[PDB]
């Protein structure tokens, strides 16, 4: 179990760690989050009390280094930083742990939610979508645009998700125009899986990361990517059986975790109705269809 200490909390802020959140008051003696499960990526995230504009946060994996949070009064945000002195940091954690100035990652033993949401998410792949190679952790916020959004403006602050475009030469083989547009199997299986992602685990990892950025930061381009990656599978007549079964589990836990009150903005009616009711895979997502019908029947 690992720890991210906090130097101080000088401004009032709602702090998230994965699917959990807690409010910290201005100058409250908060000094971090302990008992963080090893083996998964995590995200610590922030929304200031005075300006709910810009949710922002950091993806990290405690196996890769010792990370801590300190407020920068010049840039006006909580920043993640890596400490190389393993003794200086251990002294920081043990001292604050003795003073009980840390919240405990509040995982219920029965509860596999976070594993299920991050099963295929790897820090190494996050660091390629979010390019800042001098750090081992990755900053994301509400406003960051995707490479695809930019083509349609600062490159260094972009989300480099894999570009998916159903009306593109990449997606459509010359001479197979109608075939490839109505059945996206060659674009899914040859172009994307075999060519770009190499395997379904990396594809699902990017789909899962896009969803999490959509949910935790309201990142609109991430929501576009999540839906595009769903649609590309559902619109393919030929998908390996293991991928369809895994997709149903992935989406089930995403829909289960989504705040009920954000479905209006984070769920695209067209994609979901097409995916569950019209597409080739309309009968392959039983768990996802059942939760969607019972939790968001309005959208459908």
């Amino acid at each position: 179990m690992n720890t991210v200490p906090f130097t101080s909390a000088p401004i009032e802020v709602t702090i998230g760690i994965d699917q959990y959140s807690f409010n910290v008051k201005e100058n409250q003696p908060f000094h971090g989050i302990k008992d963080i499960p090893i083996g998964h990526v995590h995200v610590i995230h922030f929304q200031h009390a005075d300006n709910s504009s810009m949710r922002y946060g950091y993806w990290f994996d405690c196996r890769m280094g010792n990370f801590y949070i300190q407020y920068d009064p010049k840039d006006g945000l909580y920043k993640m930083m890596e400490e190389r002195d393993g003794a200086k940091f251990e002294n920081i954690v043990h001292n604050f742990k003795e003073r009980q100035m840390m919240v405990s990652y509040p995982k219920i033993d029965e509860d596999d939610t976070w594993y299920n949401l991050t099963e295929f998410v790897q820090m190494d792949k996050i660091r390629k979508i979010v390019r800042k190679d001098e750090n081992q952790f990755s900053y994301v916020d509400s406003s960051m645009t995707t490479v695809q959004e930019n083509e349609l403006s600062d490159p260094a602050h972009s989300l480099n998700y894999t570009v998916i475009n159903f009306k593109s030469r990449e997606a459509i083989r010359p001479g197979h125009e109608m075939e490839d547009f109505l059945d996206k199997s060659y674009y899914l299986n040859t172009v994307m899986l075999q060519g770009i992602f190499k395997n379904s685990s990396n594809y699902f990892g990017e789909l899962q990361f896009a969803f999490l950025n959509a949910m935790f930061f309201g990142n609109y381009g991430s929501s576009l990517q999540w839906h595009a990656m769903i649609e590309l599978i559902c619109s393919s007549a030929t998908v390996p059986k293991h991928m369809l079964d895994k997709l149903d589990e992935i989406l089930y836990y995403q829909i289960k975790t989504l705040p009920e009150q954000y479905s209006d903005i984070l769920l695209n009616e067209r994609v979901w109705n097409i995916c569950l009711y019209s597409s080739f895979q309309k009968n392959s997502l039983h768990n996802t269809e059942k939760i969607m019908e019972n939790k968001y029947p309005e959208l459908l």
């Binding site: 009306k167 030469r169 459509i172 010359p174 125009e177 109608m178 547009f181």
Partner: protein
């Protein structure tokens, strides 16, 4: 974006453009089977591809053999339309290729966009105008070449005859759409109007009769009356 009453003069500027109408591509007769079920029999069709400035018509005849052994023919017909339009563009010299293609039915947008991916600078546009190009098969010489075709064939016409020697493109297109709207609303009456006077003939190299300017005014007035009438005979007014 969409072509409408507001940007109508754009049709007659000097940027090459083509209308594409697919409503006569897949044509069938519905009939009963010996067992009393219903079946369709395809007949030859055509793509109606028209330069509204110059009157040049690229009539691609769709022979019934293209449907043999195919499923979902009404969907396929849109993709076949887009395939043939793309092939026509590629066949034209660069300086003759259109800058815009306007489809008369919005369901042609995605098929045509996908087939034209190699031409990113050709705009594919819908229209809000309800154009009467379905009535093209009421023009006897066009219907005749489509029905007689024994294989796929492209036939080139000028749908304005020699009208552009005397009138502008705007006026020519207005006359064409009036004639076609009339043929669409009451084909029998329209054709009676066009041929009632046996001394006015259709030149071998033309589609419409050789009316003088004054006779065209009479003809055009007769077509308007027909359209308004039928509009009354329809809604009872």
């Amino acid at each position: 974006g969409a072509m409408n009453s507001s940007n109508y003069a754009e049709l007659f500027n000097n940027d090459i453009k083509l209308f594409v109408d697919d409503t006569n591509v897949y044509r069938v007769t519905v009939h009963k089977t010996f067992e009393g079920n219903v079946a369709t029999k395809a007949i030859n069709g055509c793509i109606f591809t028209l330069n509204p400035k110059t009157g040049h018509l690229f009539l691609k005849i769709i022979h019934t053999s293209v449907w043999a052994g195919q499923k979902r023919l009404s969907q396929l017909a849109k993709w076949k339309t887009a395939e043939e339009v793309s092939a026509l563009v590629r066949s034209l010299p660069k300086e003759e290729q259109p800058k815009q293609i306007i489809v008369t039915r919005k369901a042609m947008l995605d098929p045509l966009e996908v087939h034209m991916l190699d031409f990113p600078n050709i705009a594919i546009r819908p229209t809000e105008l309800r154009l009467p190009f379905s009535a093209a098969m009421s023009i006897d010489k066009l219907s005749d070449v489509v029905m007689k075709a024994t294989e796929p064939q492209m036939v080139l016409f000028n749908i304005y005859d020699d009208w552009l020697d005397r009138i502008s493109s705007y006026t020519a297109f207005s006359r064409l759409t009036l004639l076609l709207r009339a043929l669409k609303t009451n084909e029998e009456s329209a054709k009676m109007i066009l041929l009632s006077d046996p001394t006015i003939t259709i030149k071998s190299y033309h589609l419409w009769p050789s009316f003088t300017d004054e006779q065209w005014i009479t003809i055009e007035s007769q077509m308007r009356d027909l359209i308004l009438t039928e509009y009354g005979r329809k809604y009872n007014v």
